[PDB]
Amino acid sequence: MDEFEMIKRNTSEIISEEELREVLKKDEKSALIGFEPSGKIHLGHYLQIKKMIDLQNAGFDIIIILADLGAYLNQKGELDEIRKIGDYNKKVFEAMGLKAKYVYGSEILLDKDGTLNVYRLALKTTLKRARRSMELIAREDENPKVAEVIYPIMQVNSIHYMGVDVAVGGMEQRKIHMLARELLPKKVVCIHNPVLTGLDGEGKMSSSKGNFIAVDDSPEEIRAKIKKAYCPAGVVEGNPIMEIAKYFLEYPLTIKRPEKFGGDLTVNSYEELESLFKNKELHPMDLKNAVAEELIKILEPIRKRLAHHHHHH
Numbered sequence: 001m002d003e004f005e006m007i008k009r010n011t012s013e014i015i016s017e018e019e020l021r022e023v024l025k026k027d028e029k030s031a032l033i034g035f036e037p038s039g040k041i042h043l044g045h046y047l048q049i050k051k052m053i054d055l056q057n058a059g060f061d062i063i064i065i066l067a068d069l070g071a072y073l074n075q076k077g078e079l080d081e082i083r084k085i086g087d088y089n090k091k092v093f094e095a096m097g098l099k100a101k102y103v104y105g106s107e108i109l110l111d112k113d114g115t116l117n118v119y120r121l122a123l124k125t126t127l128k129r130a131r132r133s134m135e136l137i138a139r140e141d142e143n144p145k146v147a148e149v150i151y152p153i154m155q156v157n158s159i160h161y162m163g164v165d166v167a168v169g170g171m172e173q174r175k176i177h178m179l180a181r182e183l184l185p186k187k188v189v190c191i192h193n194p195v196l197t198g199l200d201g202e203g204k205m206s207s208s209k210g211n212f213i214a215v216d217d218s219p220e221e222i223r224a225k226i227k228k229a230y231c232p233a234g235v236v237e238g239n240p241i242m243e244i245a246k247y248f249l250e251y252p253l254t255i256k257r258p259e260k261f262g263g264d265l266t267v268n269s270y271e272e273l274e275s276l277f278k279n280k281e282l283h284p285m286d287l288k289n290a291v292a293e294e295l296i297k298i299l300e301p302i303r304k305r306l307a308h309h310h311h312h313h
């Protein structure tokens with residue numbers, strides 16, 4: 001594959017592909033993604049960091065925004081707690097093999113103006129668009145706060161401030177990104193990753209108990225959580241185990257069994273795996289066992305790299 005294909009692989013949309021091809025011609029180019037700091041870093045994060053690595057392998061300079069003010073505004077807690085988690089997240093992303101520059105969103109909105117541009121954008125942004133852009137983002141609040149409509153403006157400002165060619169995020173960020181293309185003098189190319197279903201099969205992967213696989217989870221925790229995941233036979237849509245096979249696994253993939261069941265199974269592509277599962281010729285428990293074992297191998301260097309630091313040895 002060429003650079004465009006490597007970047008596009010496993011994305012949900014690129015706005016626009018034509019604009020991306022032009023960016024790829026530049027000698028210098030940069031991309032950002034922002035994260036609200038999270039106590040657990042899970043496959044949802046990993047999916048997107050993998051995409052940032054694709055960009056880095058295509059010669060992009062990578063900027064990671066640790067969105068401490070964003071998280072603060074979105075009711076994640078006190079700023080100092082949030083920043084401590086942010087620093088931990090940086091270590092995890094480093095342990096994933098990412099080469100990037102890391103900045104706190106508060107650095108922007110406080111130390112430059114910069115701060116002033118937030119006010120300028122607020123003049124241009126309707127309350128309606130701001131609130132609508134937060135639908136898939138904002139924490140639940142019966143009495144929605146001013147904080148909610150400041151959040152998207154801040155994200156648009158960070159994009160402008162960092163002067164990047166590309167902004168990356170999950171599909172939930174798309175409306176904020178559409179605002180960014182309307183509000184800033186230069187239109188940023190937007191790359192959106194799919195939303196990873198949680199292990200429970202109920203909405204996105206999040207840090208709720210048993211609902212995520214964290215990159216530093218122990219092998220026994222990975223087996224246990226995969227074993228109890230939502231995964232109905234023949235069902236590919238909304239199936240978090242099939243999603244994991246699609247987004248993280250390498251092929252050919254060998255699936256141990258049985259052989260009253262079709263015997264050992266060597267699957268050459270995800271598309272083949274999908275066909276097998278869809279036609280009910282591969283049972284959930286066999287899929288789960290393989291996915292768990294491969295995921296343990298995939299995440300092992302990350303876990304070890306973290307522990308290797310989490311001493312000084």
Ligand SMILES: N[C@@H](Cc1cc(Cl)c(O)c(Cl)c1)C(=O)O
Binds near residue numbers: 036065151152154159
């Ligand atoms: N909206 C992003 C977080 C984020 C990212 C950037 Cl870059 C921001 O500037 C702000 Cl405020 C917030 C998320 O859902 O994780």
